[PDB]
Design a protein around this ligand. Structure first.
Ligand SMILES: Nc1nc2c(ncn2[C@@H]2O[C@H](COP(=O)(O)OP(=O)(O)O)[C@@H](O)[C@H]2O)c(=O)[nH]1
Ligand SMILES: Nc1nc2c(ncn2[C@@H]2O[C@H](COP(=O)(O)OP(=O)(O)O)[C@@H](O)[C@H]2O)c(=O)[nH]1
Ligand SMILES: CN1CN([C@@H]2O[C@H](COP(=O)(O)O)[C@@H](O)[C@H]2O)c2nc(N)[nH]c(=O)c21
Ligand SMILES: CN1CN([C@@H]2O[C@H](COP(=O)(O)O)[C@@H](O)[C@H]2O)c2nc(N)[nH]c(=O)c21
Lengths: 383, 373
């Protein structure tokens, strides 16, 4: 796989990690979580707040990290990936005792994937957020010993520190949750306001790029019809793309199967490269700039992306409509359908539903009039 | 030292279990859980003097989202020829794996210290989370209703089938300090715990007509004078020596199972010594950790709240500082409530007043009568 970094081998390895971050062009990351949940016309604000009130009690317990460095001689990319198992084992008797939530399906899913929970609960690496640390960098304040038990307590947060400070590009795939959890668990409680969080986000990560958003915009919008990470990996292997040669750095395990955070980062990163290369027809480039710190959005009316530099474009509601259809529909069906009106923007809501936005107010009205003669589906305007 | 009953081997084993339940004199049970408390502290949850209704309510509000994920069951049958007890013990790993895409997706909570503790005991979490046995409560079962499906119904109820078996056999179920095991058990496999204690007491004795808590037994005459520590592991040691003797026990052919196996053995040692009807008085009184017990099958009691006062003091003090402060009133009984407070039980009701007056003149500590909010 990648490196299996657990509690018992965190310290001896840490430097290998720092080096990889420090020598990398960008890295791609991914999180595995304890669970997803204990929509539609939410303002980003309302989205944020729902995910805050309903997703953040879950534990990010496996963190994937894949560093990519471009070698200019062999025209290839060298990689290094890692699997960090993280677990808030209490430090002391007075140290806070974390209570996280588990979602049965998510657990059962990870079960179906060969995940090893023992590595998380028996061998997970500890960590501390901003407060827990500094509060304790005062307690432990006014021979050499405990100063080095401080570096043990913050434990995994050190690797986050490293990413945050490298000022290099961090790529994820549909990563709004990965980002949310990561600051929640390793920096501090998510703030009351979305504005407040966008600030907070870009100090941990200065440069974010969501592959799923990339795959869902021109020119990719027209050549790709499913943006699942698994399906995206497939589509970017065939023309008019070209999959970059990726080599495992000597002494790391390569891949040659089952989902982990590491693997998925490694894949996400490859996706990013393939889509960058196509765009030039580089990995720090100006071509990719417009994608920086715009996070992907799910199940939403007219927001194309979450802006992290803020604030977000208005919906322009009089452009949208809600459709319900046989589950047997695939994206091409939705396009071909509304093809009368030209390019459209899709946003899957269900397995049997999706939001569409049309080019003009007059158009919405019309597709509704047409649908009066169909059975397969139904069109809406205001719920 | 039970059988490891997991998902993949539940169905083929089930009959062995039914039969042991079916041939047993009594069973001993024990649960391992996901966690003890969300919010409040350990002692904040076992407050020392607080009434059942208020206790039940606490534990309801603060313990029930935790997962009972390992069930220990040991059945005991007395053989009259060799004067021995025959045993059978089981370790069920249970996990609410969702049945369908429409079936409820359970959201249980974990407490890091509990998990961490279990880790230090060799617990295998993969057994729970990858190989845990599904199950459904009263509702879910009644409700997912409306060939092969008639047979996937009996797979979805899964573990609850074992609890049904115990509940119906009407035989005695012995636990050690078992109020939580009980509450979870019905919470997970029967239905949401009810708004009131009395509604719970009803609920409790339908699932289990005959309950006996070993820790309460060991905490009463004649055992009260002969035993000084009633922790299960300590209790198992004390009941080995005089004036007891360890039951002749044999099998047929740290886990919740093992714990049950021990729990039951304690019971037998204490039954033997007591010499049934001699045992009856203990039935369906559950142990309180604070008055020593719950119901008597209704209602509990209302002890003399008089002779007790609560104190606030600087954090640096210690148990012996506190004995110092109350020397005037002879030997006393303490229940630490927290970092800077404790309850103090004085001998005579009056003494509390005179303690209140003696302390108008001192800054360090503070005092109120138990009566306050
Ligand atoms: N932004 C967002 N992400 C989610 C939500 N629910 C799940 N995810 C994440 O999105 C990822 C799935 O994205 P993708 O691979 O493209 O699958 P798909 O889009 O659901 O078909 C998962 O790894 C989840 O962590 C949600 O409500 N909002
Ligand atoms: N703040 C404070 N805590 C203490 C002191 N002495 C002991 N403790 C803690 O109080 C708790 C009492 O635990 P224990 O000695 O087992 O008695 P128990 O609480 O009744 O189980 C322990 O977990 C100790 O760590 C003290 O002087 N100050
Ligand atoms: C590409 N997708 C995605 N999708 C649904 O919408 C959600 C979008 O996930 P992503 O592929 O955005 C998923 O829950 C999936 O069930 C779909 N549902 C149907 N019926 N047909 C499709 O082609 C697709
Ligand atoms: C000053 N403190 C404070 N305190 C509080 O009592 C709580 C419960 O201890 P138990 O012995 O009930 C501890 O968690 C702690 O917060 C103490 N507990 C004990 N045993 N001894 C002490 O000196 C003190």
């Amino acid at each position: 796989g990648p490196m299996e970094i657990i509690r018992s081998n965190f310290k001896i390895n840490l430097h290998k990690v720092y080096q990889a971050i420090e020598e990398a062009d960008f890295f791609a990351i991914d999180g595995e979580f304890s669970g997803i949940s204990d929509s539609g016309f939410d303002t980003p604000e309302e989205r944020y707040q729902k995910l805050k009130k309903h997703s953040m009690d879950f534990l990010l317990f496996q963190f994937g990290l894949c560093a990519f460095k471009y070698d200019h001689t062999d025209s290839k990319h060298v990689t290094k990936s890692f699997n960090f198992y993280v677990f808030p084992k209490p430090f002391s008797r007075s140290s806070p005792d974390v209570k996280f939530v588990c979602q049965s399906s998510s657990i059962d899913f990870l079960a179906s994937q060969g995940f090893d929970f023992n590595k998380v609960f028996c061998s997970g690496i500890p960590y501390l957020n901003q407060e827990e640390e500094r509060q304790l960098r005062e307690q432990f304040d006014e021979y050499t010993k405990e100063q080095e038990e401080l570096n043990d307590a913050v434990g995994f947060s050190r690797v986050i520190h490293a990413i945050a400070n490298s000022g290099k590009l961090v790529v994820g795939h549909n990563m709004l949750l990965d980002v949310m959890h990561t600051i929640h668990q390793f920096y501090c409680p998510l703030p009351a306001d979305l504005n407040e969080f966008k600030e907070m986000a870009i100090c941990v990560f200065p440069r974010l790029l969501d592959t799923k958003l990339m795959a869902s915009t021109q020119p990719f919008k027209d050549i790709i019809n499913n943006t699942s990470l698994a399906e995206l990996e497939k589509r970017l292997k065939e023309t008019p793309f070209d999959p970059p040669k990726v080599e495992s750095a000597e002494g790391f395990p390569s891949y040659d199967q089952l989902h982990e955070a590491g693997y998925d980062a490694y894949i996400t990163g490859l996706c990013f490269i393939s889509m960058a290369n196509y765009l030039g027809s580089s990995a720090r480039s100006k071509l990719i700039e417009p994608f920086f710190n715009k996070l992907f959005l799910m199940r939403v009316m007219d927001i194309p992306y979450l802006n992290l530099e803020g604030p977000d474009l208005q919906p322009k509601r009089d452009h949208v409509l809600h459709v319900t259809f046989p589950k047997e529909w695939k994206t091409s069906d939705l396009y071909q359908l509304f093809s009368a009106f030209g390019n459209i923007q899709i946003s899957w809501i269900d397995d049997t539903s999706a939001f569409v936005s049309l080019s003009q107010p007059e158009q919405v009205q019309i597709a509704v009039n047409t649908s009066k003669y169909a059975e397969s589906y139904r069109i809406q305007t205001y719920a």
